[PDB]
Write an enzyme that holds these catalytic residues in place. Structure first.
Site, PDB file in Angstrom:
ATOM      1  N   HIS A  41       0.801  -1.229   0.000  1.00  0.00           N
ATOM      2  CA  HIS A  41       0.000   0.000   0.000  1.00  0.00           C
ATOM      3  C   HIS A  41       0.842   1.292   0.000  1.00  0.00           C
ATOM      4  O   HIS A  41       0.265   2.379  -0.048  1.00  0.00           O
ATOM      5  CB  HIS A  41      -1.073   0.032   1.098  1.00  0.00           C
ATOM      6  N   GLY A 143       2.478   6.011  10.149  1.00  0.00           N
ATOM      7  CA  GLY A 143       3.899   5.940   9.832  1.00  0.00           C
ATOM      8  C   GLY A 143       4.545   4.656  10.325  1.00  0.00           C
ATOM      9  O   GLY A 143       5.693   4.361   9.976  1.00  0.00           O
ATOM     10  N   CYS A 145       3.510   1.626   9.588  1.00  0.00           N
ATOM     11  CA  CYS A 145       3.363   0.536   8.629  1.00  0.00           C
ATOM     12  C   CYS A 145       4.714   0.048   8.152  1.00  0.00           C
ATOM     13  O   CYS A 145       5.645   0.842   7.994  1.00  0.00           O
ATOM     14  CB  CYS A 145       2.470   0.942   7.468  1.00  0.00           C
TER      15      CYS A 145
END
Ligand SMILES: CC(C)(C)Oc1ccncc1NC(=O)Cc1cccc(Cl)c1
Ligand SMILES: CC(C)(C)Oc1ccncc1NC(=O)Cc1cccc(Cl)c1
Ligand SMILES: [Cl-]
Lengths: 302, 299
Positions: A41, A143, A145
């Site tokens: 993503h 942030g 991820c």
């Protein structure tokens, strides 16, 4: 003596964390040998999130669109490929800090350490369990991820989780390092909800054995139970069914303390019925379920 | 979202852990520059000056991974032994030796045979003990905090008290608490709850969406401290209120407003409810820890 929620030392993982930027999006990547793994993503523009066609979005990208930063050094992306929900960015430098590692997919109830990261920089380390509903009750902000979950066995790091998203209830969903999501989740902003969570029974029993090993016996009783009667009771408190595999796994702890698994099950049934009555077990007023039988043995023996 | 007991990343400390053997005793040492720091009881009513004078450099076997380091000198500083070695640790991080106050938190890198086994977060109790998790061989394991890229070493493990709690020193060898490094009748004093930390954790619960415990009431610092004394809670000072200022401003709940929520929790219990997944009031998160975790500071 003592019993703490203990994480693995994070050093071997810290030397693998990098920052991955694509357009306006920045998240974390895991740099092992000449590949940087990160959530796919990172290529999405938020307007893509409802129904992204990752194959279509990825085909439009070139290597120089991905900015990878390892410390104060920019790495050169020389290739890219998608494997399930993970993006694999081939880089021109192998990580000299690459530890001995494996990619392992874990089962619900299993525990692991999470090295929470922001901008490729480690911020903290904590201990997690894969909930029976396949979510993790983590501590993650925007942030985070690409932050990873792992275990260390001898000097080998087993990467088992990569953070992808936060569900509306505040719980977290992610994938193994092959990009397969844990649970029925998708990396899309569509209406998704975690299933009803349940208590990890085998872990609560392991923690009760840890309490006995540390001298707490107040909760023991003169009773035993059949496995079936235990499960009928435990299900009413939203506890996961205890299987013969769980009973077998608890064997070593049963042998060390002299309390049969079904005897400990009877103690658990009574705790569920009565509560703790102002008492604590290993400094907790709730029954702890994020310690596996393996964690208890490791922490109480070596 | 989420609130976890979180330790600092331990990497900078892991590259400092070594095994120290002297006689039959093996424990952990901290290798910084050309010195290995470890508990002086590795040489063991012990007259440590007399026991140490009988030891030569080659009696101390220091092992850093699969490499044996050569001890070229030794000296004692309070309850810590300083073993001078020929090789400076190339992995030596930017560091300071700091002495912490009760209520302050730190990460512990538990070690056995110079090998890190786990990392956990804990607090220096008001009674100067730490409720740690240590087995035999854990002595010499260290406690630390990280600010930017500087590791502040604040604790070195020395012993376990009969109640299962732990005692140790700062890195200058000064014990935290009225303890001595000797096999003798020693007991931890009556512990109390770290009030400022409970308040910080209540603010963390509010930041994470848990508000059931909030009430319309406020209190005075004196009335709160009279209630705090009754429940074996540490006195809350004006310094603690000032330190909680940022959290008070972010959530809109004045510190004495949160104190009235805490007073009601103490007098009435949780009533089947939980806060951040706990049925007890948590006191091992400082106001700084809450800000750091609910903002995402990195190292
Ligand atoms: C608070 C907020 C913005 C959810 O940030 C988070 C907090 C904690 N862990 C992750 C995130 N971010 C995401 O979840 C980004 C995202 C959004 C939709 C789908 C996907 Cl796969 C990923
Ligand atoms: C279980 C047992 C043996 C106490 O081992 C421990 C468990 C946890 N952390 C440490 C230890 N060891 C010690 O406390 C050794 C010791 C004994 C007398 C005096 C001193 Cl200064 C040190
Ligand atoms: Cl597993």
């Amino acid at each position: 003596s003592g019993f703490r929620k203990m994480a693995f030392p994070s050093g071997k993982v810290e030397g693998c964390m990098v920052q991955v930027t694509c357009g306006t999006t920045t998240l974390n990547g895991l740099w092992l040998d000449d590949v940087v793994y990160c959530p796919r993503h990172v290529i999405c523009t938020s307007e893509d999130m409802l129904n992204p066609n990752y194959e279509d979005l990825l085909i439009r990208k070139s290597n120089h669109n991905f900015l990878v930063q390892a410390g104060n050094v920019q790495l050169r992306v020389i290739g890219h490929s998608m494997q399930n929900c993970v993006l694999k960015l081939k880089v021109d430098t192998a990580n000299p800090k690459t530890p001995k590692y494996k990619f392992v997919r874990i089962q619900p109830g299993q525990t692991f350490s999470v090295l929470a990261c922001y901008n490729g920089s480690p911020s903290g380390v904590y201990q997690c369990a894969m909930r029976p509903n396949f979510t993790i009750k983590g501590s993650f902000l925007n942030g985070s991820c690409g932050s990873v979950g792992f275990n260390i066995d001898y000097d080998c790091v087993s990467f088992c989780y990569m953070h992808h998203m936060e569900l509306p209830t505040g719980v977290h969903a992610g994938t193994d390092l092959e990009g397969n999501f844990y649970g029925p989740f998708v990396d899309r902003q569509t209406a998704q909800a975690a299933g009803t969570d349940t208590t990890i029974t085998v872990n609560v029993l392991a923690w009760l054995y840890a309490a006995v090993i540390n001298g707490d016996r107040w909760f023991l009783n003169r009773f035993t139970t059949t496995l079936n009667d235990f499960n009928l009771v435990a299900m009413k408190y939203n506890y996961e069914p205890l299987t013969q595999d769980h009973v077998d796994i608890l064997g070593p702890l049963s042998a060390q303390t002299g309390i049969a698994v079904l005897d400990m099950c009877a103690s658990l049934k009574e705790l569920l019925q009565n509560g703790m009555n102002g008492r604590t077990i290993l400094g907790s007023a709730l029954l702890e379920d994020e310690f596996t039988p393996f964690d208890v043995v490791r922490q109480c023996s070596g």
